[PDB]
Amino acid sequence: KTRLLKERLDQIYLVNERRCPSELMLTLCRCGESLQDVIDRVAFVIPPVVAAPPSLRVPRPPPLYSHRMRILRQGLREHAAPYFQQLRQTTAPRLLQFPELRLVQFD
Amino acid sequence: TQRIASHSHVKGLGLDESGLAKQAASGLVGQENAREACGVIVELIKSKKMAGRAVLLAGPPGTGKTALALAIAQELGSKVPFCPMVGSEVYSTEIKKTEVLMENFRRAIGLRIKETKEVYEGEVTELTPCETENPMGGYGKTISHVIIGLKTAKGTKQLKLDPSIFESLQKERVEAGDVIYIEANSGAVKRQGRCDTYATEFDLEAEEYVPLPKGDVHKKKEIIQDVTLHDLDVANARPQGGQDILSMMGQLMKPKKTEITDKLRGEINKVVNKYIDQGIAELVPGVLFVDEVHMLDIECFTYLHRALESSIAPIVIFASNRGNCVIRGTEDITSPHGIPLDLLDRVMIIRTMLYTPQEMKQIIKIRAQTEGINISEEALNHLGEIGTKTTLRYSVQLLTPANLLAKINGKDSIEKEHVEEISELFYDAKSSAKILADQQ
Amino acid sequence: EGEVTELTPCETENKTISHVIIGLKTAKGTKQLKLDPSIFESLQKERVEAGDVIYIEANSGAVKRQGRCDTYATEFDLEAEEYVPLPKGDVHKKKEIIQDVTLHDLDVANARPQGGQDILSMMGQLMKPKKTEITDKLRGEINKVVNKYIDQGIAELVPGVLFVDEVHMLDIECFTYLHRALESSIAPI
Amino acid sequence: TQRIASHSHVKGLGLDESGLAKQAASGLVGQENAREACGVIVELIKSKKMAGRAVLLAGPPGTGKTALALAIAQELGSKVPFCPMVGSEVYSTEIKKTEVLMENFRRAIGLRIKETKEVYEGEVTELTPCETENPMGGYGKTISHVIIGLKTAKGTKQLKLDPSIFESLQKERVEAGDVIYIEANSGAVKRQGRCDTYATEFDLEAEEYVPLPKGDVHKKKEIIQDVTLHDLDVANARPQGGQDILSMMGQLMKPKKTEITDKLRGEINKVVNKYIDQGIAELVPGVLFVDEVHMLDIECFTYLHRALESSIAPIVIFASNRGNCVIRGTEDITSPHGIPLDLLDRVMIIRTMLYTPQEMKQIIKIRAQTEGINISEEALNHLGEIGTKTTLRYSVQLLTPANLLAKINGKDSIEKEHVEEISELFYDAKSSAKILADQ
Amino acid sequence: DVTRIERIGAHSHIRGLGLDDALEPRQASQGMVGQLAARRAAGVVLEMIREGKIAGRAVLIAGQPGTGKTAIAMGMAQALGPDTPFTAIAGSEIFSLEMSKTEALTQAFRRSIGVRIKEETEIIEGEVVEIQIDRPATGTGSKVGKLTLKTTEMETIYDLGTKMIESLTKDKVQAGDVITIDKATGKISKLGRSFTRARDYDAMGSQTKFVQCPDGELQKRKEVVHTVSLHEIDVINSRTQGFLALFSGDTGEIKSEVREQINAKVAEWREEGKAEIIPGVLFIDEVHMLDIESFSFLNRALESDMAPVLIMATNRGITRIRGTSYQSPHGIPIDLLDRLLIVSTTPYSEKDTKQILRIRCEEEDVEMSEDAYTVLTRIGLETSLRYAIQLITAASLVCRKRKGTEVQVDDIKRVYSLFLDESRSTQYMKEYQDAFLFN
Amino acid sequence: DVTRIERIGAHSHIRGLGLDDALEPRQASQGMVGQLAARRAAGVVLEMIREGKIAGRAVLIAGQPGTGKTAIAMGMAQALGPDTPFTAIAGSEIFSLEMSKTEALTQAFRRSIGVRIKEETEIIEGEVVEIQIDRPSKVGKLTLKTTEMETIYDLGTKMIESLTKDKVQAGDVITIDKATGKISKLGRSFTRARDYDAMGSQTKFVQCPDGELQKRKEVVHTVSLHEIDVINSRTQGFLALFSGDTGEIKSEVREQINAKVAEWREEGKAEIIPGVLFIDEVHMLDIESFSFLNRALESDMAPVLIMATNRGITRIRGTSYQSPHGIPIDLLDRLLIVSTTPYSEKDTKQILRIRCEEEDVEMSEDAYTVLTRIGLETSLRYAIQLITAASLVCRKRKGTEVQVDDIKRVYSLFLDESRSTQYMKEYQDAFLFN
């Protein structure tokens, strides 16, 4: 027979507990400016190496494990689709420096 | 009724207009010299000229030194911040000890932000474009104004807005019968809903048929909100924007406390000074009360040396009862009040005295009145004798059990027999300690 | 590297991008290439469009949009773009360099991997980075692949010096560990 | 066949039907009084009426405290929980000590759930894509009927699905020729695999084939499962599974132990009592064994007071070999067994005695039989002499190296010279202590 | 014979304090025996708790071990009953790795104060009959429609606001299924379905998915009351999904401003009449190992108007305060003791000991001879009460193994021989002190 | 009225060191009085800081409590100015839970070194005379003018996007970055039309720009090495500048940053501005901290270190040993010691005079004499603290000057350490834990 009750907190309690602040402090570089302007000016460090994750290789993966990983990765990709570009933009590493263009004149 | 606490009977320092102390007023009795000094301290706080000046309340236990600090809070009112803390609270698992002190230093500094705005609102009725054909050239049809008519409760008025509003206007998806919100400086439209005139036995909408507003179509709103500097630090330290993935990532990982840097403090001081200069903000420096200050470590005191010398700092009130005691964090260094002499040179010391039997009796009567208890004269005298023998606080604690005992016996007042019975059902620390020799 | 002449995906159900076709132009010629969908997403990364100049590194999949070609500089009097010349080398280039690294860099790069393209690695990188207690298994594997590089003539080992000033601040646990560390065959002077 | 551990020879307490201890039985010899007391405690545990009753096994080292505890565990059987524990395990980096103790307390209490599993399983013969019939008006674009036909090694049957379950089945790309798993009451669906008759359908594969099932298609039987906190408290602490973002990226966060609230434990107790009243669950109280209990802190003992006073607590067995020693965390206060007197008043104490030479010889003989070692009577007597001179455990340890030397020398049994050579090679604690005293 | 989670504990026989209406203790009632002065004082404290007007009151229970301090506290908890918080902890539970001691005490304080909050539910509920929604026709006309609900004595047809249709399609709305919505929010929810093809069946294999049919008009205004502690409100408000920490206990150090604003909100609700406060009890057993910092925090924590009644228990006389080198009575500083009222428990007499043993025998369902009661009473007087209580179950088990019906003196003597107390075990250890370790 | 966030603190009266051009100290100047030798030494150290050639020099200020060690430190801070870094901490602040003591000291060291980055930029700055956008891919046209010249620009698409998001309209004065097309609005030169209702903010006006519409200019940005470390420590690590989650930045990042800053220095991009680290009450540091400082001071990027302590022969924390100033002699050999002497009668009087001026308090000469004798008898800080209390007491009686009776009144009300200790010894049984 069907099972009933025994949800402890009830979401209506959480609705009842309702719980009902900003400034220009982000100007960390002086002379105004958005902080991304100064971040771009002094962000140059790259990893010496960088490497991909290790891969767990087996001759014959079980079905349940692969099914779980497929479900998990599909769900994560689909639900991060609204956030995806900004997400991978924030996370990606810096692997190339290139010379600065002013060095052409300076040299 | 509201619940009765230990210091609920205290309502102020009970001082004259001249600053002299009445023998009994505002729930306090005695400690006239200490209360006069606290009068000077509330004047110092109200002057708002000083930063970081510190006070120590020193004396034996039970001399009301905690009550005097709370009396200082009552005299200042709810405008001035008053931050209470215990010395044992600095020992956090998330942040260092000196950060806890600096958080509470900033919590004691207040700020009233008095931003103003002027707006227009009501039920839209027109959505009427004007027209002048051509923009002085090759042309289709040119509008040159947009007529927007609002009516809320008091009347109706037409506004000929800038044509540029039209993009924002269908961005908000407004139609006739809706009710909107437009700000004067920006001209930014916001849809609130649609009126209750299209409601009242219709229902079934998540937008809510928001009711037709009251008042004039054109309004000037003056919002005042009180906020501390610590609130500004906490708010500006975090990436609260929900449009970034790391913000909602913050939901799952724990949002622990963090050790806020001095750069953020400086920038917030800068923008607060700019607000003060431009007239949008008013500063309200307050009080930090550190009871049980002896629990602090030598590191905490040595940091307070610098913290009290700041020009930003609030007025600080310390309280201790220890004698010549070992400083925590040191191996064998004794000092008065469990506090180093170097910090003790930085404070003004307010002494509190032991009470006479008459003062104990008077305080007991005040507490009986506060707790809604009727006590006979002989019962009060016997309770004062008990307080003389053992302690004021112990004798004060016996009132409510004795009143309950009298109510159980059907009586409406405490007689001597009830306090006599309660004094044998319950024991004091000294009597119990003497009994500990008997029961080992 | 080259000016993006055209950029067209190719997708189909096994629904998903099988690959992207891209054309590139340089002063010495032009070429059509088909690339992995990871690089295609790393192209949508930089908001790359036709006429833009790019730099792709196929080893890591790193992409840099240098800017727009100088041919389109005169097309507007004022435009927010930053213009760069056309590349002068070949469209596809194979270059040899020598990289200075330590064994610790190799250990850290594989312990906290950073160069992946799977979603799970990207989620893991959102964590606050902290140093971890790297295992001996990883160090053994790094020694194995370093020995393979040395045997293949790809790499040269340059053992060096560690200088611990004021060792008296170390405790008995640290001193006792140095008994085993100094007895290793890999350890430095 | 298992490897030979220290207590592998212990099979039980060796008590007669009257509860009195035999001189030698079930791998144990001697300790008749302690074995009889342990039998009384075994009857206490089987009664399932009490809670929080505590026992302390006390005596010198090597007198069989751990052996008697594991003998209790053997006598109870595997269907009763027996959670072994060491006092040093409470000092975790993730949770406080009292949480570790309470977690092990809950781990020693077992719950036995009975349930029937019903399932339709067989070769998919058809999916019957019948039409929508009259539209519902509200949306129209939906599915109603969708019978599925099933085949097995000795049966054929058809059944009607809810259209949502058909949508889930179609989501797995199921078609005819697939062997399918269909739970008879829930929404679970799985392709077990393509049928084995399709050997020539494709020249390669990534998934292996499966044969047909046998028996009726509607497989059905009763099952039993045993649990503790394993999937009740810790399960409700961090919600495994889920389909929102936060659960999914909780699935790749680090697993960390957290200090479970008493309220969750109370609600767990409430629901478990409800299901016991409904009859589908049986409560099986068990045993917690805390060896080296002297390593616990004063805070741990003071918590154990309240923990043992609880009505939900299990039977607890302690063990200690310390004398009048300083309690850890107190820095001045000594007490018997390294345990406070306040906790020691809450426990029944069982004393283990030192062994005679005959008992040592008998134990050595049992250990030799357990390890698969033949030994001569003269060598056994000499080894018992060594055991009386140094220690039982050392003499027991000398058996296997002597057998290895005998095998190297081409002998199938231990003689006196082999054990003598092993004694000359491997030194005991007291001999090395004498050497260090000399130098 | 069904065994539930709650089994016979140490304090299971206690059902209350056993007082008359004048708070006068009876010699034996509700499981408690003796301790007349302490029980009368506990009754006074219980009435003060039930009144709830006075905040931050503190009480200490003191005496030798085995004198009924925890029994008196459990009697207070049982007499107080549910619907008033009684938070019981040991003093060692505050030493968490996740939060400071002051934070843990703050949580324990606020967990001991209950809040009942009432909400008026303006819902519409019923069983659907028919749905008709239009196809795409540009603008908001693409999703306009109608929706018919029916109950036992009424049905009506409702227009739709064009945004909830996707929720119905997501939930797979079915003809005859039961739903309910909240006015001015929608917030559509799904309760059950009828399956009208079957009638008058439940709990067997026919009509098993039926839940309920509507029984009244759809405008089901009803009042619902939510009971919740203050600490739960702090935890819910501390995070976006901080309620999970209410299960896992993974709360950080909650911000002070959150607690202050919650206090303000609760005061607002209380003056508005929307909420009411139920101040309860916090019981800390063995406070003698709280740190000096903990006591100093308690000194100010007891001065709040939103503080509960603090009960405390301690065995010791003049002992060292933890975190210091100072001796003090009860291991507590004298600056806190002056805020306390101390009730003292006395050692029991022969009659009280015998009566306690009789009550425990009744609780454990054990029949004894009067000679056995006399023997066990002298044993309890000479050794300890808890040891004598422990011997009851062992004697009953020995009797049942003997196929007896009532435990005689011989069973008590046998069990006394098997299981030792602290004194005899200590004597035997001192006799063999050369074997026991690290003295 | 208008109480700014900075109020009268302990050292607010100090605004310099009061030194001659030849570093010879004046008897009273810039709020400082007395301590001639220490002020002269601080001036020499300030010149060392200003020249910036020598790295990692360390100085200790030593003396009894109340002798103006911290005052000399703030005097150096005020005389040095805001352009050069001056990082001030207490010794207790390094004991963090987020990071090790060595990491905290490394961050404090690198906060005190400035990098004066310099680069060229091109802007377009002018009053908007006309703008047109033919939105249906979008095209448009813009017109800008100065007082000297005017020019019409045919706009690209992304410039039109930026203009629309910023809602640029005619009459505005804007600055357009030629490199990336960022727009910043400076104000308006022409009023908006008064025909339009509800968009009627008065605002304020700005003059038209002068000269060429397009200009090339140099810009200078100043960042600390710690900022560069935290930005490069991780992706989105800039948030840790404010939150402080900078836990144990890897050393390889710092080596890369030092090399890049050096090559920027040689390539003309940047200048190193070495500042000062001040650690007040340095006796709180552990032996490990001093050992780390021994090697941290030997780097070329090290700043000037200044320390203040009062201890005599005193235990070193983390050890059972004793040494001068609570500091090991490994570090004391690496530094120069500056000694502050106690003040005389006249110097105390001048300090009280300067403090009354800062607090806006008028007192009679008898009051000054009495307060000077009180300060000599008890302490300088106590006498300073009595000034405000005496002024308040005078104010509540509607007086105009602080008199001797007000001073004696507050002397009775508020107690010093000696009297409080004496009275505590009288109630020694009543006080706890002697």
Q: How many domains does chain D have?
A: 3
Helix E370-382 and helix E385-401, axial crossing angle in degrees, nearest 10: 140
Scanning F110-139 for CB atoms below 8 A from A yields 115, 117, 119-120
Label each residue of E160-190 as H, E or C: CCCCCHHHHHHCCCCCCEEEEEECCCEEEEE
B307-320 b/e (C-beta count within 10 Å ≥ 16 → b): bbbbbbbbbbbbbb
> B230 with B242, same domain?
no
Please choose, from the candidates B310, B115, F242, the residue with its C-alpha nearest in 3D space to the C-alpha of residue A25. F242
- Which chain E residues touch B256 with a CB distance below 8 Å? 252-253
Helix A63-80 and helix A84-91, axial crossing angle in degrees, nearest 10: 100
Name the one residue in this structure whose structure tokens are 């809810």: D162
- Which chain C residues touch F176 with a CB distance below 8 Å? 78
- Which chain C residues touch D252 with a CB distance below 8 Å? 120, 123-124
Candidates A8, A63, A75; nearest CB to D248: A75
- Which chain A residues touch D248 with a CB distance below 8 Å? 72, 75-76, 79
Asked if C123's CB is within 8 angstroms of D249's CB, the reply is yes
Instruction: Select from B233, B240, B244, B245 the residue whose CB has the most chain A CBs within 10 Å, as the one to mutate to test that interface.
Output: B245
Please choose, from the candidates F253, E255, E250, the residue with its C-alpha nearest in 3D space to the C-alpha of residue B238. E255
DSSP secondary structure letter of residue D114 = E
Q: What is the DSSP annotation of D296-365?
A: S-HHHHHHHHHHHT-SS--EEEEEE-B-SEEPTTTSS-EEGGGS-HHHHTTEEEEE-PPPPHHHHHHHHH
Cβ–Cβ < 8 Å for F306, F294: no
Query: Nearest residue on chain F to A36, judged by CA atoms?
Result: F238
DSSP 3-state of E50: helix
Please choose, from the candidates D98, F42, B432, the residue with its C-alpha nearest in 3D space to the C-alpha of residue E249. D98
Distance from CA of D146 to the nearest CA of B (A): 35
Residue ranges at the known binding site of B for ATP: 59-66
Helix F380-396 and helix F365-377, axial crossing angle in degrees, nearest 10: 140
Residues 6+ apart with CB under 8 A from B396: B363, B364, B367, B387
Query: Nearest residue on chain C to B253, judged by CA atoms?
Result: C127
Please choose, from the candidates F250, F213, F246, F252, the residue with its C-alpha nearest in 3D space to the C-alpha of residue F230. F246
Instruction: Select from F122, F138, F155 the residue whose CB has the most chain C CBs within 10 Å, as the one to mutate to test that interface.
Output: F155
Q: B252 at the C interface (CB within 8 A)?
A: no
Q: What is the DSSP annotation of E369-415?
A: -HHHHHHHHHHHHHT-HHHHHHHHHHHHHHHHHTT-SSB-HHHHHHH
Please give the method by which this entry was determined.
cryo-EM
Candidates D36, D260, D342; nearest CB to E418: D36
Q: E244 at the F interface (CB within 8 A)?
A: no
Asked if B405's CB is within 8 angstroms of E294's CB, the reply is no
Q: What is the DSSP annotation of E369-380?
A: -HHHHHHHHHHH
Asked if A28's CB is within 8 angstroms of B231's CB, the reply is no
Asked if C80's CB is within 8 angstroms of F158's CB, the reply is yes
DSSP 3-state of D10: coil
Q: State the residue range of the domain holding D145.
A: 108-235
Cβ–Cβ < 8 Å for D223, D160: no
Gyration radius of chain C's alpha carbons: 24
Candidates F223, F232, F252; nearest CB to A38: F223
Scanning C35-64 for CB atoms below 8 A from D yields none
- Which chain A residues touch F222 with a CB distance below 8 Å? 30
CATH number for the domain harbouring residue C13: 2.40.50.360
> B212 with B273, same domain?
no
Asked if D207's CB is within 8 angstroms of A75's CB, the reply is no
Alpha carbons D368 and D363: distance in angstroms, whole number: 9
Please choose, from the candidates A57, A79, A78, A75, the residue with its C-alpha nearest in 3D space to the C-alpha of residue A67. A75
Q: Which helix (H) or strand (E) holds B349?
A: strand B347-351
Alpha carbons B306 and E373: distance in angstroms, whole number: 72
Alpha carbons C110 and C139: distance in angstroms, whole number: 10
Alpha carbons D238 and D256: distance in angstroms, whole number: 10
> D112 with D138, same domain?
yes
Domains and CATH numbers, chain E: 9-113+229-348 (3.40.50.300), 349-439 (1.10.8.60)
CB pairs under 8 A between B and C: 4
Instruction: Select from D68, D321, D341, D345 the residue whose CB has the most chain E CBs within 10 Å, as the one to mutate to test that interface.
Output: D345
Distance from CA of D303 to the nearest CA of E (A): 6
Task: Tell me if there are at least 3 CB pairs under 8 Å linking chains D and F.
Answer: no
Contacting F with CB below 8 Å, chain A residues are 25, 28-31, 35, 38-39, 41-45, 48, 90-93, 100, 102-103, 106
Resolution (A): 2.4
Q: D252 at the B interface (CB within 8 A)?
A: no
> B180 with B274, same domain?
no
Q: What is the DSSP annotation of D266-285?
A: HHHHHHHHHHHHHTSEEEEE
Asked if C131's CB is within 8 angstroms of F157's CB, the reply is no
Query: Nearest residue on chain F to E324, judged by CA atoms?
Result: F433
Cβ–Cβ < 8 Å for C3, C18: no
Alpha carbons E13 and E359: distance in angstroms, whole number: 7
Alpha carbons F128 and F145: distance in angstroms, whole number: 7
Chains in contact with chain D (at least 3 beta-carbon pairs closer than 8 A): A, B, C, E
What is the CA angle E415-D319-D334, rounded to 5?
100
Asked if F252's CB is within 8 angstroms of C105's CB, the reply is yes
- CA-based torsion, B30, B34, B40, B45: positive or negative: negative
Alpha carbons E184 and E182: distance in angstroms, whole number: 7
Total residues belonging to chain E: 439
What is the CA angle B371-B376-B380, rounded to 5?
75
- Has E216 been labeled as part of a binding site? no
* Domain final position from D235, D261, D296: D235
Chains in contact with chain B (at least 3 beta-carbon pairs closer than 8 A): A, C, D, E, F
Asked if D36's CB is within 8 angstroms of E425's CB, the reply is no
User: Which runs of consecutive H residues, i.e. helices, occur in chain C?
Assistant: 37-45, 103-111, 119-125, 136-151, 172-182
CATH number for the domain harbouring residue B313: 3.40.50.300
> B121 with B63, same domain?
no
Beta-strand relationship, F335-340 and F58-63: parallel
Task: Tell me if there are at least 3 CB pairs under 8 Å linking chains E and A.
Answer: yes
Cβ–Cβ < 8 Å for F112, F86: yes
Q: How many CA atoms lie within 13 A of C89 on its CB side?
A: 8
Candidates F159, F245, F287; nearest CB to C128: F245
Please choose, from the candidates F295, F251, F287, F302, the residue with its C-alpha nearest in 3D space to the C-alpha of residue C164. F295
* Domain final position from D354, D377, D400: D354
B198-214 b/e (C-beta count within 10 Å ≥ 16 → b): ebeeebbbeeebeebbe
- Which chain E residues touch B6 with a CB distance below 8 Å? 56, 302-303
> D267 with D283, same domain?
yes
DSSP 3-state of D385: helix
Q: D252 at the C interface (CB within 8 A)?
A: yes
Asked if B264's CB is within 8 angstroms of F198's CB, the reply is no
Alpha carbons E385 and E353: distance in angstroms, whole number: 7
Alpha carbons F409 and B19: distance in angstroms, whole number: 12
- Which chain F residues touch E334 with a CB distance below 8 Å? 432
Alpha carbons E381 and E421: distance in angstroms, whole number: 13
- Which chain E residues touch B436 with a CB distance below 8 Å? 317-318, 329-330
Distance from CA of C130 to the nearest CA of B (A): 15
F14-35 b/e (C-beta count within 10 Å ≥ 16 → b): bebbbbeeeeebeebebbbbbb
Q: What are phi and psi of C41, to 5 degrees?
A: -70, -30
- Has D66 been labeled as part of a binding site? yes
CATH number for the domain harbouring residue B374: 1.10.8.60
Alpha carbons B204 and E188: distance in angstroms, whole number: 11
CB pairs under 8 A between A and F: 49
> D370 with D262, same domain?
no
